[PDB]
RNA sequence: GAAGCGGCCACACCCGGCUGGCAACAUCCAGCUCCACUCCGAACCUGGAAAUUAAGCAGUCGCGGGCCACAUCAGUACUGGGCUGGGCGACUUCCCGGGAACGUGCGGUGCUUGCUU
RNA sequence: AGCUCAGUGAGGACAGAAAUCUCACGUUGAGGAUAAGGCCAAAAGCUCAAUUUACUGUGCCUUUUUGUACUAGGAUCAGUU
RNA sequence: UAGAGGUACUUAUUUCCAAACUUCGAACCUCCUUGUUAGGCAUUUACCUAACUGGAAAUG
């Protein structure tokens, strides 16, 4: 029972490309998906290529827990019929990926905002990742608790029926 | 024009004529220490000579 | 050019390397301090034969490359670069100075720019090696009587008891490689601490 | 494959935290400050009202420091409380201060002064109270919250405590939020108050226990005088001890035993 | 170049150890002084307000205020000629109570003991004192391992 | 044995295994008020108690990394005095004194201050 | 009061050696107006919030007495925020 | 300086170094103490302590 996997959160981002009234259009595009008022990210260095001051709103991101994080994923594999590449994963078990065309999550009447792609990302942990996060009796959590790469691709087949 | 800066060749020959041990009056100095503890030590005196 | 070198032979300041503060420094003559066959081993290559030299003072990095040269050039004509390893075991740091001269402001702000590299020798400092089979014994002795006269004072010549570069003596070398506490790197011997 | 961080010369160069920066329970920033005391008052003792709350137990004391170390002279502890009345809920806000009046009245009758600071204080020709300094730790000091609830509890008992400052005190909010999920929801009631039924207390009780909770304190504050300690500590040994041992120390010569088996396997033995 | 600021040729005075860098222990704040105390200054390289000289490191002196947080110490610099006196002002952490005495007050306490339990059986004392490391009684040894110590002959080893 | 409070602050740290939960510590469960997230009850805060020792914690194991200790290393390196000693010099015998380091070998891996069931 | 930096490692629509997001390790190598050297990790750093102690008045101490001062710094007392 | 092992870097090594490098660390130096030390008693205080038949200090 507790060495379940589960959820920990899914957090999005958006970056527009470009500074702008972009930006905070791209805040409306979470806040009406996520029913969560998104936190706008600053920038911190100029590079004159991209287009990029050091201290300039660039995107926008949001993070999201509990039945609401387990509910967009179902939506949003969906777009891809359930299936995403091996190598998705990182060595803590925690893995990515893309839906550029938005409104597929999603649906949506654009008119004043635009069309904005999305960078979503898991976190699968146990339950007692408390003790890293936790200030009165700080420690480092075992090595059984902590999540294998294969291990969380077994978790992936197991629970959305999917396949890589 | 040029000559010498200094030397230290006689320094321990002239102190050692003569190291002199400066004796210190008495431990307290009553012009540093706290006030508030001097203001009481006068009130000490002064109630015990009545 | 060069001054003479009785003018840096002996060491009358404290060691004076290349860094921050020195900036304007000339590289040394010295690239390659090892020839021969590099990749070989303790076991093919087993007989040693050192240039030990008997005085505290600075060796230039001039000296050190003309060792080098006669070294190889003699080897090559003998046995032909098969057998042999040389290595060069000073490495010149220490960067001296002049006050230069060439009117003039003599002895006035008298430090001087840096001239080039050199090497502090200690007495029984080791200055070169050659590590051979017990064919070529004879060409390696040869070898390094011609790169003494290169070097500055009077050094000796001799031959080692301990194997190749490794700080072991042939009876120790068969007791230690028996009890298999020894091992080998690709090059030189690596022991085993059992830890 | 990049810098192995945690080399040799990591861990030989790496200076540890104290020990309780490490099991990361004091802070020694505010524990150099707590302490301290003027030198022109030389040996003086302060007191400091420590208040730590863990799940269930509220604990409370009042402590001394010493270079041994430091030394309780009293002490209070929410699992008492169902002596005094309050069965359960025994780390709410309520029994948080009923802990305070527990530490403040002890402390005041072993001293022999429960005459005198009988209420809250708020000056001259009249005795000055008991200078008691909170310890919260590193528990978050935010209005409204159970270390401030000790500290009303010690204030109202007796102790000036300096500060800059009845509901949530005789069971209200608990009582409150019974009533939401006893009225809407019901399934929620059973798994939020399942102890409470049992007693089962109920939502109005709770305005009522306490009261009497603070008067039965107030009369009869001092309790437990065991001795002596020694053959009190005993039988704590006993009476909570594992059922399975600990696993306990191999000796010296059976550790060279089992390496060298080991060793048996891939070669190379015996010695260490 | 030579230069006469306040913190200056102090680059290994004030380092703080090797593995003792941070803070010091609450325990230290809790010590006490009083006046006559005799007490060694060496410095916390950490802690910045109210330090002494670079001089009096390492230097003993005698306690003559004490105040909120720091004691006035008298110690004895050697100007020029003559031993001068110092009233210093420093803060408790860089103060500690000095053993130089510990050794004396020992040997009274000691005396004592000796000078009061001759009487109690009485009986009769022998007067006890310090004494250089003097030169031994005669006495007879046996051994039962003898080596025999020889310079061997000269071998390189390279 | 467990817990709050600490003292010296690695024999206590760091990686990885194994064995324990009567109470206690904890994970954990839930979100209404106190108040909390420049978004999120994750944290912080408040109210719980269903089931667990999987993790923290406790004890213990590893020819473990590190740390600590003793013995070798070594009368070596260096060094305070003395010579109408040697040596072109650079440096260095000897006489009267003091005396390391790295390395290697074997051992160890927290000892208990005051209050409580 | 809360938080941890530099960096390395893996990931993540457009995304590239460099944009923003995430986890993991992270004794401090970053940062602290500037020279160089110390010092510092639930801080002395970074962020947020409220503020004016960068305040008033006299002695005292250190640098420095083989030469007393000014500059700078330090411990107090008497106020007040 | 120069090879071997991993995926130019990197894990262990190796030849050889630093007045403005230090994880160790001498010799030679330097500073303090070595006769009065333990108490007990009761006056003084506007100071300190929650309190005085306490603390702190000086008078006997």
């Known amino acids: 029972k507790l060495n379940e996997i589960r959820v920990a959160k899914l957090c999005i981002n958006i970056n527009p490309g470009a500074v702008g009234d972009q930006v905070t259009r791209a805040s409306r595009v979470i806040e009406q998906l996520t029913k969560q008022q998104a936190m706008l990210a600053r920038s911190h260095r100029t590079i004159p290529k991209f287009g990029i001051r050091r201290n300039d709103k660039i995107a926008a991101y949001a993070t999201i827990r509990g039945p609401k994080a387990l509910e967009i994923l179902n939506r949003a594999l969906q777009v891809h019929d359930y299936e995403i590449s091996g190598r998705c994963f990182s060595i803590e078990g925690n893995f990515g990926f893309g839906i550029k065309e938005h409104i597929d999550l999603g649906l949506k009447y654009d008119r004043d905002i635009g069309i904005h792609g999305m960078d979503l990302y898991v976190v699968l942990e146990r339950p007692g990742n408390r003790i890293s996060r936790r200030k009165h009796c700080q420690s480092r959590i075992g090595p059984n608790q902590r999540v294998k790469r294969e291990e969380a691709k077994e978790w992936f087949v197991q629970k959305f029926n999917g396949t890589l | 024009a040029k000559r010498s800066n200094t030397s230290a060749h006689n320094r321990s020959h002239q102190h050692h004529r003569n190291i002199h041990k400066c004796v210190v009056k008495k431990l307290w100095f009553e012009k540093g220490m706290n006030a508030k503890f001097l203001r009481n030590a006068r009130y000490a005196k002064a109630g015990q000579n009545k | 050019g060069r001054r003479p070198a009785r003018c840096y032979r002996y060491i009358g300041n404290k060691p004076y390397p290349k860094s921050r503060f020195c900036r304007g420094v000339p590289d040394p003559r010295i690239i390659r301090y090892e020839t021969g066959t590099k990749t070989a081993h303790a076991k093919e290559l087993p007989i040693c034969c050192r240039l030990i030299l008997l005085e505290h003072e600075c060796v230039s990095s001039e000296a050190l490359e003309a060792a080098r040269v006669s070294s190889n050039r003699y080897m090559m004509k003998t046995m032909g670069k098969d057998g042999y390893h040389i290595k060069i075991n000073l490495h010149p740091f220490h960067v001296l100075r002049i006050n230069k001269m060439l009117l003039q402001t003599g002895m006035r702000h008298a430090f001087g720019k840096p001239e080039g590299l050199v090497a502090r020798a200690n007495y029984n400092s080791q200055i070169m090696t050659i590590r051979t089979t017990s064919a070529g014994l004879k060409h390696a002795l040869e070898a390094l009587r011609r790169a003494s006269f290169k070097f500055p004072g009077h050094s000796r010549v001799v031959i080692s008891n301990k194997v190749g570069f490794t700080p072991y003596t042939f009876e120790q070398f068969k007791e230690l490689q028996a009890n298999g506490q020894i091992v080998d790197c690709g090059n030189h011997v690596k022991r085993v601490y059992r830890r | 494959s990049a810098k192995l961080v945690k080399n040799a010369g990591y861990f030989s160069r790496f200076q540890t935290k104290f020990r309780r920066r490490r099991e990361a329970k004091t802070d020694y920033v505010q524990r150099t400050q707590l302490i301290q005391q003027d030198k022109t008052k030389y040996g003086a003792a302060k007191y400091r009202l420590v208040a730590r709350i863990t799940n269930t137990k509220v604990i409370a004391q009042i402590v001394v420091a010493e270079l041994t170390g430091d030394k309780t002279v009293c002490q209070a502890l929410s699992t008492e409380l169902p002596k005094y009345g309050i069965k359960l809920g025994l780390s709410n806000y309520p029994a948080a201060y009923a802990t305070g009046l527990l530490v403040a009245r002890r402390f005041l009758t072993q001293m022999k002064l429960a005459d005198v600071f009988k209420t809250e204080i708020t000056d001259e020709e009249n005795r000055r109270p008991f200078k008691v300094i909170l310890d919260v730790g590193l528990a978050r000091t935010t209005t409204g ?40 929801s019901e399934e929620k009631y059973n798994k939020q108050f399942s102890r409470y039924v049992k007693a089962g207390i109920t939502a109005d009780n709770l305005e009522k226990i306490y009261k009497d909770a603070h008067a039965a304190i107030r009369k009869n504050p001092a309790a437990t005088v065991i001795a002596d300690k020694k053959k009190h500590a005993e039988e704590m040994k006993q009476k909570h001890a594992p059922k399975k041992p600990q696993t306990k120390k191999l000796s010296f010569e059976e550790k060279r035993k089992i390496l060298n088996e080991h060793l048996v396997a891939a070669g190379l033995p015996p010695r260490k | 170049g030579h230069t006469e600021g306040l913190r200056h040729a102090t680059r290994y005075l004030f380092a703080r150890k090797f593995r003792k860098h941070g803070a010091p222990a609450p325990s230290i704040t809790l010590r006490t002084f009083r006046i006559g105390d005799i007490v060694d200054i060496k410095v916390n390289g950490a802690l910045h307000s109210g330090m002494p000289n670079r001089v009096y490191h390492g230097a003993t002196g005698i306690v003559w205020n004490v105040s909120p947080h720091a004691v006035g110490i008298l110690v004895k610099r050697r100007v020029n000629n003559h031993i001068a006196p110092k009233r210093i002002y420093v803060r408790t952490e860089h103060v500690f109570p000095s053993k130089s005495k510990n050794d004396f007050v020992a040997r009274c306490q000691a005396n004592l003991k000796a000078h009061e339990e001759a009487k109690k059986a009485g009986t009769k004392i022998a007067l006890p004192k310090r004494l250089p490391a003097q030169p031994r009684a005669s006495h007879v040894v046996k051994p039962e391992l003898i080596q025999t110590i020889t310079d061997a002959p000269f071998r390189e080893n390279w």
């Not at chain 4, 401030?148 to 949530?168: E, T, W």
């Open chain 4, 145 to 184: 919250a159970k270390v401030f609830a000790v500290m009303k509890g010690a204030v109202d008992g007796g102790l000036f405590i300096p500060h800059n400052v009845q509901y949530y005190i005789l069971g209200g909010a608990v009582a409150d939020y019974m009533r939401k999920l006893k009225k809407e």
